[PDB]
Amino acid sequence: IRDECCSNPACRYNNPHVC
Known part of the structure; x- marks a missing residue:
């Protein structure tokens, strides 16, 4: 998963x- 996922x-x- 990305830390910029949103x-x-x-x-x-x-x-x-998730966001």
Whole structure:
């Protein structure tokens, strides 16, 4: 997971409730 996960569209991708 990225430390910029909420900025990161790629983390965002599967993780929209992460932030």
